[PDB]
Amino acid sequence: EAVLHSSTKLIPANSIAIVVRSSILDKVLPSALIKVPATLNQDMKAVIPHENILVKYIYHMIGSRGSDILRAAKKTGGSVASIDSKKLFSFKIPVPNINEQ
Amino acid sequence: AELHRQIWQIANDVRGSVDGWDFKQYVLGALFYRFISENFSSYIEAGTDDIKDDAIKTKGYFIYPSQLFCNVAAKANTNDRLNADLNSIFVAIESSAYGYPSEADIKGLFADFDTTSNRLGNTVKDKNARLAAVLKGVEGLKLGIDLFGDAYEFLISNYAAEFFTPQHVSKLIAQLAMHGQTHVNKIYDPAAGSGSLLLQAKKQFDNHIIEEGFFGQEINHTTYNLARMNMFLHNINYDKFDIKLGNTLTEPHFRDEKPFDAIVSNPPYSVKWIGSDDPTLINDERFAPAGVLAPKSKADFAFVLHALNYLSAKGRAAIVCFPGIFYRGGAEQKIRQYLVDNNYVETVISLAPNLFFGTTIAVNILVLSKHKTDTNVQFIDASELFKKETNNNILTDAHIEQIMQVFASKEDVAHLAKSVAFETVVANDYNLSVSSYVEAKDNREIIDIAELNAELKTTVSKIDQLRKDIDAIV
Amino acid sequence: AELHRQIWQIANDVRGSVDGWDFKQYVLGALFYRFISENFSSYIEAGTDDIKDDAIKTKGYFIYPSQLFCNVAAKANTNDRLNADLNSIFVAIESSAYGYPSEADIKGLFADFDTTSNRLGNTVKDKNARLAAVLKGVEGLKLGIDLFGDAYEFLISNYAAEFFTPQHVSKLIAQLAMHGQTHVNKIYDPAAGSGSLLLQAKKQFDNHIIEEGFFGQEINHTTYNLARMNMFLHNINYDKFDIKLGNTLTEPHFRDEKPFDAIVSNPPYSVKWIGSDDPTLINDERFAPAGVLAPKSKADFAFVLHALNYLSAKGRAAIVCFPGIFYRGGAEQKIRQYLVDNNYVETVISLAPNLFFGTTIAVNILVLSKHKTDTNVQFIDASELFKKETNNNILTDAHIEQIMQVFASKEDVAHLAKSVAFETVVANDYNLSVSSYVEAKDNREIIDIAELNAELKTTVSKIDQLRKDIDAIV
Amino acid sequence: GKTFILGYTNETHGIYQASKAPVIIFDDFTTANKWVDFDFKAKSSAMKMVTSCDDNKTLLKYVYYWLNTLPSEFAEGDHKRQWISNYSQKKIPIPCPDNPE
DNA sequence: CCAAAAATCTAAAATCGAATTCGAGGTCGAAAAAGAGAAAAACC
DNA sequence: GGTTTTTCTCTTTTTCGACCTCGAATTCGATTTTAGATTTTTGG
């Protein structure tokens, strides 16, 4: 019933997700293959890709490049919060052909 | 701590016997009266010295310390004479005692101050016994060349338990107000709090540098009172040396005296004020060059604008902030834009958390100048300073010495911050300060050295599993 | 929460506009004056009802509520008449208003109470505007059968942020004061704090049980004041219903009235007092049967000895402690020895941490009786109650109902506590209470089912290592 | 918990130096955590030292292994409490009386 | 009168506890700020 | 007079707040036996 005013989106069951709050600003940022339809809070992000891909490759790509995509937008102030939206959003990764997925 | 730390503990013993602020007012008034009495006796009898004095009546001679120190104590109402007749009924003559130095109308009064020691108190004999016990306990403080007020610094630091400074950070920002400028004056302070950060330079430069006394402004009433007695304890000249009461956002004074030459401050954080704003304070002399005000949740940079208003043609400035005021929406962004409009903002230096009294956040200091080269230089600093147990650190005189060495001539030292460009900061959205720390300890390894080790792990592992299978005989 | 929770939030809105205690005094005095005015008007005009009243002058008729409620409000100094002339200069007539019910010398005064609303305040117009704004904001509280004081319970719970009770625990210990005893009286309380725990029984038993009003004693002055107005709000008879001020360790009263029949309490913890002791308080009427005092760091059981002193021949008793008072050295051991000298200590029941306001420890309740069988029964209780987020739990009426079912007739229920013996507690060193929780979840397995599974792990593992060795082609 | 915090200068502080095979117990309010003194280590801020008088019977890594056998009370960290005398009483099984053969 | 034994008083190692404290790591509410739709004004 | 464009508010996102909140871990004072010595009393 709470989706009347959850301010959330129900997402599909083959997704990835990533935190933007308070483990990074210090350390490694986690991520996980979420295998069920679900929702998350204010304090992290859900990502589905679009069809030109294989989704596990995106997961391993992000978990590989985590240690420098945290470096790209690390500080964002001395506040308790962490990485900006835009510089997180505006990173380029090498996306190959399907046989190299 | 040699012969000191025992007396620090004696002050801790004297800290009885109720909630701290109430008796603390009487404690500060007692030591204040004792110090004024001893300084006045030291002036009038440096050579025949008399414990008990006389009614010598010579007013013409009396008015000359009333021009010099501005206050006759009295003929016989000094402390050392009053210390003879202790426990004597009654005690309220001290009120009349505060009538004596408060005459002081000639010249430039600096009086109207000592209204702290009121009366509560429930009976007159309670008042007599309590105040006489306080005077007896403060008389036994064996202090007497005559360093006195550091125990006062302890007792004023013993509260909010406000937040003033861990005093080596004040010595640091004093060394930021350096260098080499025997140039009137020093030092103005908006929201001074105590006179602790308003002390270090001229106390170190008693006749090294010779400019003028100190000016400032502070919000609270009782903080204003303890600030005036704080600055009065440290044997500082009467000359113009004062702070006026008020708020810089509401009563900015003094404009006419003068464009200052050096300023330090500790502005409090998140200090939301009247919005946004109902008077014409956009169109004042200092916020109209910015372009927009400083609203409620972002009420910080009004202090730094008020700071940069009162500045000379050459003399530098140094203020403290916390790095959370980073971009803070477009209003603070355009405030930062007018700050980076020139080399107004010269350097910024971060300082590791906490190094304070349970705040627990990091801070940074902004050093400003109309003395340009010019490029921006974000020499921020992380670790190391110890922080929590005793003070801590506090703090590593060689470390601040070498950071002054870095501040001297613009080095580019990795594993530490370095210079940037104006092109870099317009490439930023005026950020404070992500650039330019580099080190991350991401250390390489070797494929083969790791994998043959893992093979050794397996050659241990499988035979130990075999021996467990041997041990499965039950 | 149906039509309530909105008004709880309205009280939260009214919570402005300075530090809470200062304006909170005026808030409580305002709602107190409003409720007394409405109750007095409800008494005098239940049938011709008049918003505005007259100067009818008939003193002989006036003295009859001055015998009944003990206080005439006034002819025209009620709230509803004063609510017409709001914002009218001046406001200090309220002081003279407090002269009116404080006449009350006939009979059994219960006055000398309403000295809360003092004046600070810096100008008279500040006082007028502020107090008129407070009266206007408290007038708009749409409350009006007439449940009023639960918002008062909210506002008094909104501080120390003292620690009183999460009110279902008070309902629990009220149900411990049960059962079936229409027997004067209830209820004495040492260190009552609020009247919250002194409320539940007779408010539930308004004419179910009929014994007497309530007695008690409390330490602090302002806590005493808020306690008297707390117990006064809930429409309770004037009859003998009171608390006196003092400390039970220093002014134990009332001995002569009477040996009580039921008591509950919330004694504060680690409450070190004068030692050990300088007067003859060993040789009083209540600590001489123990054998030794309760010293400074172990200052708890003086309250429970003072509790068991004031007890009937049959009526039970219930107090709260924390289980850290366990053996606590030989002094508390021999205190426990005199406690277990009979079946004085009947039952003990533990309660899981926290179930309080950030304490964060567990507690336990001791139920005592001179109503014996006799053997000791340590029916302690662990989980489950939720604790932290909103209140929490709060709390599981079937769970306390079934623990009353356990308390009824002495069951021996495993995965839960049970009875013990006097031989068991002398086999203990009078411990409180290790016995008798049993369950540990140490669950067995199977050798063969585990090892062939591990063999399946190996048959996966070695071929996957082989495939890694295939993948070592670089 | 996790039995390792960082370095410190390891000599001339009156350090206990943690000789060949004592054992420790953690602690007041817990008395459950057990760690073999590995080689020669610190006296880190809460520790209570357990060894034996006898050498030719005890070999107290034997009783390190024997001590974690009994989580009977040691599944109860619940009350604020010291346990030193209580575990210090008894019991353990011993291959006596064919000692010291 | 002297010597020995017992009791008391003091130091100090030895225990013991703390309506907790410390700190690593995550808030949830909310201010405040951008996107769509509606209204008003200006121009053709 | 009608249509189009721009702006303002209202709906919906979204990103911060000298924090805050749960698991893990715990240093000083308060308090007690034992080590021991010294003094006093009793007995030979």
Curated annotation (Swiss-Prot), chains B, C:
GO terms for molecular function: DNA binding; N-methyltransferase activity; site-specific DNA-methyltransferase (adenine-specific) activity. Residues 1-161 are annotated as: N-terminal domain. GO terms for biological process: DNA restriction-modification system; methylation. Signal peptide: none annotated. It catalyses: a 2'-deoxyadenosine in DNA + S-adenosyl-L-methionine = an N(6)-methyl-2'-deoxyadenosine in DNA + S-adenosyl-L-homocysteine + H(+). Residues 162-437 are annotated as: Catalytic domain. Keywords: DNA-binding, Methyltransferase, Plasmid, Restriction system, S-adenosyl-L-methionine, Transferase. It is an enzyme of class 2 (transferase). Pfam families: HsdM_N, N6_Mtase. Residues 445-474 are annotated as: C-terminal tail. InterPro entries: D12N6_MeTrfase_N, DNA_Adenine_Mtase, DNA_methylase_A-5, DNA_methylase_N6_adenine_CS, Restrct_endonuc_T1M, SAM-dependent_MTases_sf, T1MK-like_N_sf. Coiled coil: none annotated. CDD domains: AdoMet_MTases. Its EC number is 2.1.1.72. It comes from the Bacteria. S-adenosyl-L-methionine binds at residues 162-167, 194-196, 218. The C-terminus is required for assembly of the restriction enzyme complex. The individual domains assume different positions in the enzyme, allowing the holoenzyme to regulate the methylase, endonuclease and translocation states. Belongs to the N(4)/N(6)-methyltransferase family. The type I restriction/modification system is composed of three polypeptides R, M and S; the restriction enzyme has stoichiometry R(2)M(2)S(1) while the methyltransferase is M(2)S(1). There is an equilibrium between R(2)M(2)S(1) and R(1)M(2)S(1); the latter is methylation and translocation proficient but restriction deficient. (Microbial infection) Holoenenzyme interacts with Escherichia phage T7 protein Ocr; this interaction leads to the inhibition of the restriction activity, but may still allow methylation and translocation. Type I restriction and modification enzymes are complex, multifunctional systems which require ATP, S-adenosyl methionine and Mg(2+) as cofactors and, in addition to their endonucleolytic and methylase activities, are potent DNA-dependent ATPases. The subtype gamma methyltransferase (M) subunit of a type I restriction enzyme. In the presence of the R subunit the complex can also act as an endonuclease, binding to the same target sequence but cutting the DNA some distance from this site. Whether the DNA is cut or modified depends on the methylation state of the target sequence. When the target site is unmodified, the DNA is cut. This is Type I restriction enzyme EcoR124I/EcoR124II methylase subunit. The gene is hsdM.
From Swiss-Prot, chain D:
The chain holds residues 52 to 152 of 404 of the full protein. It comes from the Bacteria. GO terms for biological process: DNA restriction-modification system. Contains two DNA recognition domains (TRD), each specifying recognition of one of the two defined components of the target sequence. The specificity (S) subunit of a type I restriction enzyme; this subunit dictates DNA sequence specificity. The presence or absence of a 4-residue repeat changes the sequence specificity; a third copy of TAEL inserted at position 179-180 changes the recognition site from 5'-GAAN(6)RTCG-3' (for EcoR124I) to 5'-GAAN(7)RTCG-3' (for EcoR124II). Residues 1-101 are annotated as: Target-recognition domain 1. The type I restriction/modification system is composed of three polypeptides R, M and S; the restriction enzyme has stoichiometry R(2)M(2)S(1) while the methyltransferase is M(2)S(1). There is an equilibrium between R(2)M(2)S(1) and R(1)M(2)S(1); the latter is methylation and translocation proficient but restriction deficient. (Microbial infection) Holoenenzyme interacts with Escherichia phage T7 protein Ocr; this interaction leads to the inhibition of the restriction activity, but may still allow methylation and translocation. This is Type I restriction enzyme EcoR124I/EcoR124II specificity subunit. Keywords: DNA-binding, Plasmid, Restriction system. GO terms for molecular function: DNA binding. Type I restriction and modification enzymes are complex, multifunctional systems which require ATP, S-adenosyl methionine and Mg(2+) as cofactors and, in addition to their endonucleolytic and methylase activities, are potent DNA-dependent ATPases. It comes from Escherichia coli. Belongs to the type-I restriction system S methylase family. The gene is hsdS. The keyword DNA-binding applies. The keyword DNA-binding applies.
